[PDB]
Every structure is written in C-alpha cells, then in structure tokens.
Amino acid sequence: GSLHMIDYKEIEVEEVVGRGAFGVVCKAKWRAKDVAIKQIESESERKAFIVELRQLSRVNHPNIVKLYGACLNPVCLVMEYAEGGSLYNVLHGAEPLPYYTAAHAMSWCLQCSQGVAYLHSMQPKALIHRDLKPPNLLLVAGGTVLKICDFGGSAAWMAPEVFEGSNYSEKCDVFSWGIILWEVITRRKPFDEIGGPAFRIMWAVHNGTRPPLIKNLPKPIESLMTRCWSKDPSQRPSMEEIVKIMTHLMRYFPGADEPLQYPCQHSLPPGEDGRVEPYVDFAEFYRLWSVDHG
Numbered sequence: 001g002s003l004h005m006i007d008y009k010e011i012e013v014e015e016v017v018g019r020g021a022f023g024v025v026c027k028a029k030w031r032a033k034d035v036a037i038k039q040i041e042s043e044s045e046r047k048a049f050i051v052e053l054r055q056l057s058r059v060n061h062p063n064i065v066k067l068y069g070a071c072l073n074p075v076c077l078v079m080e081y082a083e084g085g086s087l088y089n090v091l092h093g094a095e096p097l098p099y100y101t102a103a104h105a106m107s108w109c110l111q112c113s114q115g116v117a118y119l120h121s122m123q124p125k126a127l128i129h130r131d132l133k134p135p136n137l138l139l140v141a142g143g144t145v146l147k148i149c150d151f152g153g154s155a156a157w158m159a160p161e162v163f164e165g166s167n168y169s170e171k172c173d174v175f176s177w178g179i180i181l182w183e184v185i186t187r188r189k190p191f192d193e194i195g196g197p198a199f200r201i202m203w204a205v206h207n208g209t210r211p212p213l214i215k216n217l218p219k220p221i222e223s224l225m226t227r228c229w230s231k232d233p234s235q236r237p238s239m240e241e242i243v244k245i246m247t248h249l250m251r252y253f254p255g256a257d258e259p260l261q262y263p264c265q266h267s268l269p270p271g272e273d274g275r276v277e278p279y280v281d282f283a284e285f286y287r288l289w290s291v292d293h294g
C-alpha cells in the first residue's frame with residue numbers, strides 16, 4: 001500500500017473537530033479541498049501513528065475513512081473530511097438533534113459491517129478494529145454514508161474476552177457491532193444507567209448483563225443482535241454473515257438514501273422495566289414483510 005508525502009506548509013490547519021485515542025483532529029485545507037488532520041501531540045504517539053500509517057496504507061474501502069497521505073515533520077495524518085461528523089453526535093450530541101428512520105439505523109449498521117468484513121478479509125492477516133463504537137463511525141452524503149475511522153470510555157461496546165485479558169479474535173468486533181445495532185434502534189447510550197468507572201460496566205458485562213430487550217423488535221433483528229452479544233465468541237456470526245443478513249433485510253427498509261434534514265424533539269427517554277421502546281418505528285417493516293410472506 002502507498003501514501004502521499006505532504007509538507008505541513010501545504011496544509012491550512014483550521015479548527016479542532018474532535019479528539020481520539022491519540023492525537024487531535026482538526027478541519028484543514030490541502031490542495032484547494034477540505035481534509036481532516038490528525039496531528040501528533042506527544043513523542044509517545046509516534047509508534048501508534050506509524051502502525052496506523054502502514055495499516056491504513058493497505059486499506060481501500062468505501063466504508064472506511066480514506067487516508068490521503070501523511071507528513072513526517074510534524075507527524076500528521078491527512079484524511080478525507082467527514083462533513084457529517086460522528087454517529088455519536090448524530091445520536092446523542094448537542095440539540096437540535098436530527099430525525100432518523102429505521103432505514104437509516106439498519107443502513108448505518110449494514111455499512112459498518114461492510115467495512116469491518118473488508119478488514120476481516122485482509123490477507124495475509126485479518127485486521128481487527130477493536131474499538132468499534134459511534135465516536136469512531138463518521139457520516140457523509142447528508143448523514144447517509146457511514147465510514148469507519150481510528151482502528152484500535154469504550155467498556156460499553158467491549159467484548160467480555162477483551163477486558164478479561166483473554167485471547168480474542170475478530171469476533172470482538174462482532175460483539176461491538178451488536179451493541180451499536182441496539183444503540184441506533186433505541187437512540188440510548190448502552191449502560192448509561194450503570195454509573196462509572198469502567199470496571200462497573202466490565203463487571204456487569206462479564207457477569208452476563210446485556211442492554212435491555214427492545215419492545216416490538218422484529219424477531220429476525222432480535223436474533224441477530226443477541227447472537228452478536230453471545231458470551232462464547234464462537235457462537236457469534238462472522239461479519240460476512242452479518243453483511244448478507246443485513247443486505248437481505250434492507251429490502252424491508254427503503255429510504256436509507258434520504259439525507260438527515262428534519263429537526264427532532266422526540267428526545268425524551270420513557271422508562272426501564274427490563275424492556276425499552278425503540279426510537280425507530282418498525283410498522284413499515286412489518287407491513288413490507290407481510291406483502292412478501294403473507
């Protein structure tokens with residue numbers, strides 16, 4: 001895999017757009033176009049920036065944030081600017097929050113599984129993301145196109161074998177994906193009710209706690225979600241299987257290409273009796289499903 005060699009002088013560093021695992025993300029201008037720059041803040045980040053460089057140099061997929069190139073003085077990654085910001089901000093950010101549909105929710109998850117299945121298909125060795133969560137998922141094309149960034153606060157999406165220090169596989173990303181599917185359908189932060197620190201989430205998840213069940217969730221979606229959540233990573237489906245299932249389910253989710261443009265004030269969490277109400281509405285799914293089946 002190859003990457004551009006860029007002069008920091010060619011970059012017009014604009015405002016800070018966020019902060020990740022290491023470094024800082026700024027909006028910037030490079031070769032008349034808009035970019036996202038992840039600059040180095042401390043000498044300790046060098047090993048991570050280099051590993052991210054060699055990894056992202058071989059990665060080319062529509063659902064993965066494109067790394068245009070890099071600077072080596074100072075060390076900085078020049079990427080495509082995801083104008084729609086993070087999925088976390090769309091779901092849980094500052095008001096006004098956008099309205100979104102069951103079709104957007106399923107589409108975002110399909111697209112995330114498409115990018116992760118590409119990473120897992122990597123030869124000679126599969127690439128594991130290890131930090132799949134809404135802050136690391138970015139949106140473009142009016143909030144309709146999802147792109148994964150920052151390959152590995154995260155305890156709520158972490159597979160129990162990972163924090164157990166156990167030998168884990170690409171099945172840890174499948175667990176995180178299952179949590180994200182619950183999170184987009186409910187528009188709730190997973191394990192928000194469990195007060196911090198992280199060890200309290202880890203203890204609960206390690207003991208079998210999973211997000212509450214969704215009232216009126218279609219049985220095929222419920223089965224997929226809970227299989228992804230399995231304690232035993234060998235019982236979880238592969239990403240290739242999630243892609244196929246999610247692809248087939250989209251026939252009952254039209255409208256995923258509709259940009260996010262509507263204001264939303266639905267933004268009120270009802271209650272918790274072991275079961276939560278979905279934020280999205282499955283009425284149209286059930287209707288479209290009946291036409292095909294009976």
Ligand SMILES: */C1=C/C(=O)[C@@H](O)[C@@H](O)C/C=C/c2cc(OC)cc(O)c2C(=O)O[C@@H](C)C1
Pocket residue numbers: 017018019020021025035036038065079080081082083084085086135136137138149150
């Ligand atoms: C991808 C994820 C990441 O580090 C997160 O911490 C993220 O939430 C920070 C924000 C990144 C960001 C934000 C915008 O618009 C607000 C646009 C972008 O292109 C990016 C971006 O590319 O972030 C990645 C470098 C990291």
